[PDB]
Amino acid sequence: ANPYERGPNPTDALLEARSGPFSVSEERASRFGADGFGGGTIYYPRENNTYGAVAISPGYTGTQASVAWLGERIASHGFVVITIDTNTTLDQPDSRARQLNAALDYMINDASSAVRSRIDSSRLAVMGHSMGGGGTLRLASQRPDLKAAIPLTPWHLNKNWSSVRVPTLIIGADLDTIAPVLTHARPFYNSLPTSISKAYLELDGATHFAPNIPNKIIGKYSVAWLKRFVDNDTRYTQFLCPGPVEEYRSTCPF
Ligand SMILES: [Cl-]
């Protein structure tokens, strides 16, 4: 059996719905009370159990509100999720990486007992939009013990992520003019090791701000990636492999 399995056997409809089956509550992490980042909102399942934990970073000039819909949707599938604000809205990717790391530590050690007791601190993931997606890549290369990483329309000036060993799903936007897939998302995916679990999903007819809007495909494949790799939940493999969307690549079957 799999002791990390939660919720029903998945279907396309259940993954595309506005919320998963877990009702979620919220707990604030205030800016001054949060060491190493600018605070945020922790979404957690009311159902008492232990879950993987996920930290999500917005991009340049962005606040947690630009990723709020996605933190809540992922939590409604059985995860503890914090959407952070950064120290400043101008912080750069490698700074956002340290803030993502501090946010994981915050949920584990500084949040209330209701939050901490719902976390399996051995099962963690990071995600990020644009520069926060670059921060995701940087933290992943620094922390090989992370279970999953999901950069969303990522932005970074370093294109060499061959040091990343964390199962990584990159989501690009074909019409992105701020982080063009040709010079960001695609070289990122290609430079990740051929020997790790990884995938590249390029959204069709989407702009750089597609991750900031409730999006059926982003929620579906983000949850599937997290279920498969944070929860070891192989009921979700058949949605990642062979996969769907303008372009899809992967090291399926994994
Ligand atoms: Cl609160």
Three-state SS annotation for the chain: CCCCCCCCCCCHHHHHCCCCCCCEEEEEECCCCCCCCCCEEEEEECCCCCEEEEEEECCCCCCHHHHHHHHHHHHCCCEEEEEECCCCCCCCHHHHHHHHHHHHHHHHHHCCHHHHCCEEEEEEEEEEECHHHHHHHHHHHHCCCCCEEEEECCCCCCCCCCCCCCCEEEEEECCCCCCCCCCCHHHHHHHCCCCCCEEEEEECCCCCCHHHCCCHHHHHHHHHHHHHHHCCCHHHHHHHCCCCCCEEEECCCC
**Cβ contacts of 248 within 8 Å, gap of 6 or more:** 199, 200, 201, 202, 242
Active-site annotation holds for 208: yes
What domains sit in the chain, N to C, each tagged with a CATH number? 1-254 (3.40.50.1820)
Residue of 85, 91, 120, 176 with catalytic role: 176
- Count Cβ atoms below 10 Å from residue 61 Cβ, excluding itself: 11
Tokens of residue 159, six digits: 């294109």
Tokens of residue 44, six digits: 């957690």
* Ligand 1 midpoint to CA 110 (Å): 13
CA distance 147 to 54: 10
* Ligand 1 midpoint to CA 111 (Å): 10
* Ligand 1 midpoint to CA 14 (Å): 29
Pair 128, 140: CB distance under 8 Å? no
Residues ending a continuous segment of the chain before a break (C–N > 2.5 Å): 244
Pair 10, 220: CB distance under 8 Å? no
* Ligand 1 midpoint to CA 28 (Å): 4
Active-site annotation holds for 130: yes
Residue of 130, 141, 197, 222 with catalytic role: 130
Binding residues: 60, 131, 155
Closest alpha carbon to 72 in 40, 36, 48: 40
The span from the first CA to the last CA of the chain, in angstroms, equals: 19
* Ligand 1 midpoint to CA 27 (Å): 4
CA distance 125 to 157: 23
- Count Cβ atoms below 10 Å from residue 107 Cβ, excluding itself: 25
Q: What are phi and psi of 19, to 5 degrees?
A: -140, 150
Beta bridge partners of 149: 126, 168
Cα separations in angstroms, 40 against 68, 85, 162, 194, 206: 10, 5, 31, 35, 27
Tokens of residue 83, six digits: 């959407």
Q: b/e per residue, 154-164, with b = 16+ CB within 10 A?
A: bbbeeeebeeb
* Ligand 1 midpoint to CA 172 (Å): 34
**Cβ contacts of 223 within 8 Å, gap of 6 or more:** 15, 20, 73, 74, 77
Beta bridge partners of 202: 172, 247
Residue of 57, 95, 208, 222 with catalytic role: 208
Binding residues for poly(ethylene terephthalate): 60, 131, 155
Pair 20, 13: CB distance under 8 Å? no
Pair 64, 31: CB distance under 8 Å? no
Give the CA dihedral 131, 193, 170, 127, nearest 10 degrees.
Answer: -60
**Cβ contacts of 104 within 8 Å, gap of 6 or more:** 53, 55, 124, 126
Q: b/e per residue, 181-193, with b = 16+ CB within 10 A?
A: beebbbbbbeebe
